[PDB]
Amino acid sequence: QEVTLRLVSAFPENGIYVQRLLPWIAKVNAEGKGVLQINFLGGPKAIPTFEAGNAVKTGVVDMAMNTGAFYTNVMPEADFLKLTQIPVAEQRKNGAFDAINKVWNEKGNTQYLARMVENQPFHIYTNKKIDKPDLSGQKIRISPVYRDFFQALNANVVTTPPGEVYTALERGVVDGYGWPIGGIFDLNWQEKTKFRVDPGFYDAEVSLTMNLPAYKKLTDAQRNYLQKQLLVLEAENTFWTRYGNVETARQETAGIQTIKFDAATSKAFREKAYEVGWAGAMKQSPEVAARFKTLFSKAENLYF
Numbered sequence: 001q002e003v004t005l006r007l008v009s010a011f012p013e014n015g016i017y018v019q020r021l022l023p024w025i026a027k028v029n030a031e032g033k034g035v036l037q038i039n040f041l042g043g044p045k046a047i048p049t050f051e052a053g054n055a056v057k058t059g060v061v062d063m064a065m066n067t068g069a070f071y072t073n074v075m076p077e078a079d080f081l082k083l084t085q086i087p088v089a090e091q092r093k094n095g096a097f098d099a100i101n102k103v104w105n106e107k108g109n110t111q112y113l114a115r116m117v118e119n120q121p122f123h124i125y126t127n128k129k130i131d132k133p134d135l136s137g138q139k140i141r142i143s144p145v146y147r148d149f150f151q152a153l154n155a156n157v158v159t160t161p162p163g164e165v166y167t168a169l170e171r172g173v174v175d176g177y178g179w180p181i182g183g184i185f186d187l188n189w190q191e192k193t194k195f196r197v198d199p200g201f202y203d204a205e206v207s208l209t210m211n212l213p214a215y216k217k218l219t220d221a222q223r224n225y226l227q228k229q230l231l232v233l234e235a236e237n238t239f240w241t242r243y244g245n246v247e248t249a250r251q252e253t254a255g256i257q258t259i260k261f262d263a264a265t266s267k268a269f270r271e272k273a274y275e276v277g278w279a280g281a282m283k284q285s286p287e288v289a290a291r292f293k294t295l296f297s298k299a300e301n302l303y304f
Protein backbone atom coordinates (compact mmCIF):
# COMPACT_ATOMS: atom_id res chain seq x y z
CA GLN A 1 0.00 0.00 0.00
CA GLU A 2 3.07 2.28 -0.11
CA VAL A 3 3.95 3.05 -3.72
CA THR A 4 7.42 3.99 -4.93
CA LEU A 5 7.60 6.12 -8.06
CA ARG A 6 10.75 6.30 -10.14
CA LEU A 7 11.71 9.78 -11.30
CA VAL A 8 14.40 10.90 -13.74
CA SER A 9 15.80 14.35 -14.43
CA ALA A 10 16.26 15.49 -18.01
CA PHE A 11 18.59 18.23 -16.71
CA PRO A 12 22.16 17.83 -15.46
CA GLU A 13 22.42 16.98 -11.79
CA ASN A 14 24.80 19.87 -10.94
CA GLY A 15 22.08 22.31 -12.14
CA ILE A 16 19.85 24.51 -10.02
CA TYR A 17 16.70 22.59 -11.12
CA VAL A 18 17.96 19.32 -9.62
CA GLN A 19 19.23 21.23 -6.60
CA ARG A 20 15.65 22.45 -6.02
CA LEU A 21 14.21 19.04 -6.81
CA LEU A 22 16.22 16.95 -4.34
CA PRO A 23 15.04 18.62 -1.05
CA TRP A 24 11.49 18.37 -2.28
CA ILE A 25 11.89 14.64 -2.95
CA ALA A 26 13.40 14.29 0.54
CA LYS A 27 10.27 15.96 2.00
CA VAL A 28 7.93 13.76 -0.05
CA ASN A 29 9.69 10.68 1.26
CA ALA A 30 9.97 11.81 4.89
CA GLU A 31 6.27 12.67 5.06
CA GLY A 32 4.91 9.84 2.88
CA LYS A 33 6.04 6.66 4.62
CA GLY A 34 3.46 3.91 4.08
CA VAL A 35 1.78 5.99 1.35
CA LEU A 36 4.08 7.24 -1.41
CA GLN A 37 7.80 7.55 -2.07
CA ILE A 38 9.94 8.82 -4.92
CA ASN A 39 13.09 7.10 -6.08
CA PHE A 40 15.31 9.66 -7.82
CA LEU A 41 17.14 7.80 -10.52
CA GLY A 42 19.38 10.61 -11.61
CA GLY A 43 19.83 12.69 -14.65
CA PRO A 44 20.67 12.36 -18.33
CA LYS A 45 23.06 9.52 -17.54
CA ALA A 46 20.02 7.47 -16.46
CA ILE A 47 17.88 8.23 -19.51
CA PRO A 48 19.07 10.57 -22.25
CA THR A 49 17.78 14.17 -22.02
CA PHE A 50 15.71 14.06 -25.21
CA GLU A 51 14.22 10.65 -24.39
CA ALA A 52 12.88 11.33 -20.91
CA GLY A 53 9.57 12.36 -22.42
CA ASN A 54 9.25 9.00 -24.19
CA ALA A 55 10.25 7.16 -21.03
CA VAL A 56 7.40 8.83 -19.17
CA LYS A 57 4.88 8.26 -22.00
CA THR A 58 5.64 4.53 -22.22
CA GLY A 59 6.11 4.06 -18.47
CA VAL A 60 9.76 3.09 -18.59
CA VAL A 61 9.89 5.42 -15.57
CA ASP A 62 6.96 6.88 -13.63
CA MET A 63 7.92 10.55 -13.44
CA ALA A 64 10.30 13.19 -14.80
CA MET A 65 11.53 16.66 -14.17
CA ASN A 66 11.76 18.01 -17.68
CA THR A 67 10.80 20.79 -20.09
CA GLY A 68 8.40 20.21 -22.97
CA ALA A 69 11.09 21.58 -25.30
CA PHE A 70 12.90 18.27 -24.68
CA TYR A 71 9.95 16.07 -25.74
CA THR A 72 8.55 17.46 -28.94
CA ASN A 73 9.23 13.91 -30.17
CA VAL A 74 6.24 12.87 -28.02
CA MET A 75 4.04 15.76 -29.20
CA PRO A 76 4.92 19.10 -30.89
CA GLU A 77 2.62 20.79 -28.41
CA ALA A 78 5.12 19.96 -25.64
CA ASP A 79 7.11 23.13 -26.45
CA PHE A 80 4.09 25.49 -26.17
CA LEU A 81 4.43 26.05 -22.41
CA LYS A 82 7.26 28.53 -23.02
CA LEU A 83 4.49 30.88 -24.10
CA THR A 84 2.61 31.11 -20.81
CA GLN A 85 2.26 34.70 -19.67
CA ILE A 86 0.56 33.93 -16.38
CA PRO A 87 2.12 31.98 -13.49
CA VAL A 88 1.09 28.43 -12.73
CA ALA A 89 -0.97 29.45 -9.67
CA GLU A 90 -3.13 31.52 -12.04
CA GLN A 91 -3.14 28.71 -14.64
CA ARG A 92 -4.75 26.42 -12.08
CA LYS A 93 -7.57 28.93 -11.67
CA ASN A 94 -8.32 30.15 -15.22
CA GLY A 95 -8.47 26.86 -17.14
CA ALA A 96 -4.92 26.85 -18.62
CA PHE A 97 -3.63 24.12 -16.35
CA ASP A 98 -6.58 21.83 -17.01
CA ALA A 99 -6.28 22.35 -20.76
CA ILE A 100 -2.54 21.57 -20.65
CA ASN A 101 -3.19 18.39 -18.76
CA LYS A 102 -5.92 17.25 -21.10
CA VAL A 103 -3.62 17.67 -24.08
CA TRP A 104 -0.78 15.97 -22.26
CA ASN A 105 -3.11 13.05 -21.41
CA GLU A 106 -4.49 12.66 -24.91
CA LYS A 107 -1.45 13.35 -27.05
CA GLY A 108 1.29 12.07 -24.74
CA ASN A 109 -0.20 9.53 -22.33
CA THR A 110 1.17 11.83 -19.62
CA GLN A 111 -0.27 13.64 -16.58
CA TYR A 112 0.98 17.23 -16.19
CA LEU A 113 1.61 17.49 -12.45
CA ALA A 114 3.28 20.75 -11.53
CA ARG A 115 5.41 23.62 -12.84
CA MET A 116 8.51 24.15 -10.68
CA VAL A 117 10.26 26.78 -12.80
CA GLU A 118 8.64 30.03 -14.04
CA ASN A 119 9.60 33.71 -13.90
CA GLN A 120 12.86 32.81 -15.67
CA PRO A 121 12.88 34.59 -19.04
CA PHE A 122 15.10 33.28 -21.80
CA HIS A 123 17.99 35.29 -23.21
CA ILE A 124 20.48 35.17 -26.03
CA TYR A 125 24.04 34.68 -24.70
CA THR A 126 26.98 35.21 -27.05
CA ASN A 127 30.66 35.96 -27.46
CA LYS A 128 30.05 38.24 -30.50
CA LYS A 129 28.84 41.75 -29.81
CA ILE A 130 25.72 43.04 -31.55
CA ASP A 131 24.11 46.47 -31.60
CA LYS A 132 21.01 45.37 -33.53
CA PRO A 133 18.45 42.61 -32.83
CA ASP A 134 20.07 40.44 -35.51
CA LEU A 135 22.09 37.25 -35.18
CA SER A 136 23.39 37.17 -38.78
CA GLY A 137 26.64 35.25 -39.05
CA GLN A 138 26.37 33.82 -35.53
CA LYS A 139 26.27 30.14 -34.63
CA ILE A 140 23.93 29.61 -31.67
CA ARG A 141 23.23 26.56 -29.53
CA ILE A 142 19.49 25.88 -29.09
CA SER A 143 16.73 23.55 -28.07
CA PRO A 144 13.23 23.87 -29.59
CA VAL A 145 12.53 26.89 -27.29
CA TYR A 146 14.58 29.22 -29.48
CA ARG A 147 14.32 27.68 -32.96
CA ASP A 148 11.58 29.80 -34.54
CA PHE A 149 12.76 33.07 -32.92
CA PHE A 150 16.51 32.60 -33.49
CA GLN A 151 15.96 31.67 -37.13
CA ALA A 152 13.84 34.81 -37.58
CA LEU A 153 16.90 36.61 -36.22
CA ASN A 154 18.96 34.89 -38.95
CA ALA A 155 21.08 32.74 -36.62
CA ASN A 156 22.67 29.50 -37.68
CA VAL A 157 21.36 27.15 -35.01
CA VAL A 158 22.60 23.86 -33.62
CA THR A 159 20.71 21.67 -31.16
CA THR A 160 22.41 20.28 -28.06
CA PRO A 161 21.21 19.11 -24.66
CA PRO A 162 22.31 21.28 -21.72
CA GLY A 163 25.12 18.88 -20.86
CA GLU A 164 26.93 19.54 -24.16
CA VAL A 165 26.88 23.33 -24.06
CA TYR A 166 30.25 23.82 -22.35
CA THR A 167 31.98 21.54 -24.83
CA ALA A 168 30.42 23.34 -27.81
CA LEU A 169 31.60 26.69 -26.42
CA GLU A 170 35.16 25.55 -25.56
CA ARG A 171 35.64 24.06 -29.04
CA GLY A 172 34.22 27.16 -30.76
CA VAL A 173 31.47 25.07 -32.36
CA VAL A 174 29.04 27.87 -31.37
CA ASP A 175 29.32 31.60 -30.68
CA GLY A 176 26.50 31.60 -28.14
CA TYR A 177 23.40 29.90 -26.82
CA GLY A 178 19.86 30.32 -25.55
CA TRP A 179 19.26 29.82 -21.82
CA PRO A 180 17.19 31.39 -19.04
CA ILE A 181 18.52 34.33 -17.04
CA GLY A 182 19.42 31.84 -14.26
CA GLY A 183 21.80 28.89 -14.14
CA ILE A 184 24.67 29.64 -16.58
CA PHE A 185 27.28 29.21 -13.79
CA ASP A 186 26.17 25.71 -12.83
CA LEU A 187 28.03 24.09 -15.68
CA ASN A 188 30.69 26.81 -15.70
CA TRP A 189 29.46 28.49 -18.91
CA GLN A 190 30.40 31.95 -17.65
CA GLU A 191 33.98 31.06 -18.61
CA LYS A 192 32.99 31.25 -22.28
CA THR A 193 30.23 33.89 -22.32
CA LYS A 194 30.92 37.60 -22.98
CA PHE A 195 27.44 39.07 -23.46
CA ARG A 196 23.76 38.64 -22.51
CA VAL A 197 21.14 40.29 -24.73
CA ASP A 198 18.21 41.96 -23.01
CA PRO A 199 15.33 41.90 -22.79
CA GLY A 200 14.34 38.31 -21.99
CA PHE A 201 11.57 36.53 -23.91
CA TYR A 202 9.12 33.68 -23.20
CA ASP A 203 9.28 31.98 -19.77
CA ALA A 204 11.19 28.84 -18.90
CA GLU A 205 8.97 25.83 -18.26
CA VAL A 206 10.30 23.06 -16.09
CA SER A 207 7.68 20.71 -14.74
CA LEU A 208 6.98 17.37 -13.20
CA THR A 209 5.11 14.95 -15.41
CA MET A 210 3.95 11.37 -14.83
CA ASN A 211 3.00 8.31 -16.87
CA LEU A 212 -0.80 8.52 -17.08
CA PRO A 213 -1.64 4.87 -16.39
CA ALA A 214 0.69 5.01 -13.36
CA TYR A 215 -1.06 8.18 -12.23
CA LYS A 216 -4.52 6.58 -12.56
CA LYS A 217 -3.31 3.55 -10.60
CA LEU A 218 -2.61 5.69 -7.53
CA THR A 219 -5.19 5.32 -4.79
CA ASP A 220 -7.05 8.45 -3.65
CA ALA A 221 -4.85 8.59 -0.57
CA GLN A 222 -1.65 8.48 -2.63
CA ARG A 223 -2.85 10.94 -5.27
CA ASN A 224 -4.07 13.42 -2.67
CA TYR A 225 -0.76 13.26 -0.82
CA LEU A 226 1.19 13.71 -4.04
CA GLN A 227 -1.02 16.65 -4.96
CA LYS A 228 -0.53 18.29 -1.57
CA GLN A 229 3.24 18.11 -2.02
CA LEU A 230 3.15 19.28 -5.64
CA LEU A 231 1.40 22.41 -4.42
CA VAL A 232 4.17 22.89 -1.86
CA LEU A 233 6.73 22.75 -4.68
CA GLU A 234 4.82 25.38 -6.71
CA ALA A 235 4.31 27.55 -3.63
CA GLU A 236 8.09 28.02 -3.58
CA ASN A 237 8.09 29.47 -7.12
CA THR A 238 8.53 32.86 -5.43
CA PHE A 239 12.20 31.75 -5.28
CA TRP A 240 12.65 32.43 -9.01
CA THR A 241 12.32 36.18 -8.35
CA ARG A 242 15.40 36.58 -6.13
CA TYR A 243 17.18 34.00 -8.24
CA GLY A 244 16.78 36.00 -11.45
CA ASN A 245 17.92 39.23 -9.74
CA VAL A 246 20.93 37.53 -8.10
CA GLU A 247 22.02 35.69 -11.26
CA THR A 248 21.75 38.95 -13.18
CA ALA A 249 24.10 40.59 -10.69
CA ARG A 250 26.40 37.53 -10.75
CA GLN A 251 26.77 37.83 -14.49
CA GLU A 252 27.67 41.55 -14.23
CA THR A 253 30.24 40.82 -11.54
CA ALA A 254 31.84 38.06 -13.60
CA GLY A 255 32.41 40.48 -16.49
CA ILE A 256 29.51 39.52 -18.70
CA GLN A 257 28.29 42.61 -20.51
CA THR A 258 24.62 43.34 -21.04
CA ILE A 259 23.55 44.29 -24.54
CA LYS A 260 20.61 46.75 -24.43
CA PHE A 261 18.37 48.31 -27.10
CA ASP A 262 16.11 51.35 -26.81
CA ALA A 263 12.53 51.04 -25.51
CA ALA A 264 10.92 50.70 -28.96
CA THR A 265 13.47 48.18 -30.20
CA SER A 266 13.29 46.06 -27.00
CA LYS A 267 9.50 46.03 -27.19
CA ALA A 268 9.54 44.96 -30.85
CA PHE A 269 12.14 42.30 -30.09
CA ARG A 270 9.91 40.58 -27.52
CA GLU A 271 6.83 41.01 -29.66
CA LYS A 272 8.66 39.33 -32.52
CA ALA A 273 9.60 36.42 -30.24
CA TYR A 274 5.97 35.83 -29.30
CA GLU A 275 4.68 36.56 -32.75
CA VAL A 276 6.92 33.93 -34.39
CA GLY A 277 6.58 31.64 -31.36
CA TRP A 278 2.83 31.46 -31.76
CA ALA A 279 3.00 31.25 -35.58
CA GLY A 280 5.14 28.14 -35.16
CA ALA A 281 2.77 26.56 -32.62
CA MET A 282 -0.16 27.35 -34.91
CA LYS A 283 1.62 25.62 -37.81
CA GLN A 284 2.32 22.49 -35.73
CA SER A 285 -1.04 22.22 -33.96
CA PRO A 286 -3.63 24.90 -34.85
CA GLU A 287 -6.49 23.83 -32.59
CA VAL A 288 -4.42 23.30 -29.47
CA ALA A 289 -2.31 26.40 -30.05
CA ALA A 290 -5.47 28.57 -30.35
CA ARG A 291 -6.91 27.07 -27.17
CA PHE A 292 -3.70 27.67 -25.21
CA LYS A 293 -3.13 31.19 -26.57
CA THR A 294 -6.50 32.27 -25.29
CA LEU A 295 -5.74 30.86 -21.81
CA PHE A 296 -2.03 31.82 -21.60
CA SER A 297 -2.73 35.55 -21.04
CA LYS A 298 -5.14 37.67 -18.97
CA ALA A 299 -7.05 40.48 -20.74
CA GLU A 300 -6.00 43.21 -18.26
CA ASN A 301 -2.35 42.29 -18.88
CA LEU A 302 -2.54 42.27 -22.69
CA TYR A 303 -1.72 45.94 -23.12
CA PHE A 304 1.18 45.77 -20.59
Ligand SMILES: O=C(O)C(=O)c1ccccc1
Nearest residue numbers: 067069143145178204205
Ligand atom coordinates in the same frame (compact mmCIF):
# COMPACT_ATOMS: atom_id res chain seq x y z
O1 LIG B 1 17.92 25.78 -23.32
C1 LIG B 1 17.31 24.71 -23.09
O2 LIG B 1 17.90 23.60 -23.14
C2 LIG B 1 15.87 24.70 -22.71
O3 LIG B 1 15.04 24.29 -23.51
C3 LIG B 1 15.48 25.06 -21.33
C4 LIG B 1 14.12 24.97 -20.99
C5 LIG B 1 13.71 25.29 -19.71
C6 LIG B 1 14.68 25.72 -18.79
C7 LIG B 1 16.04 25.83 -19.14
C8 LIG B 1 16.45 25.49 -20.43
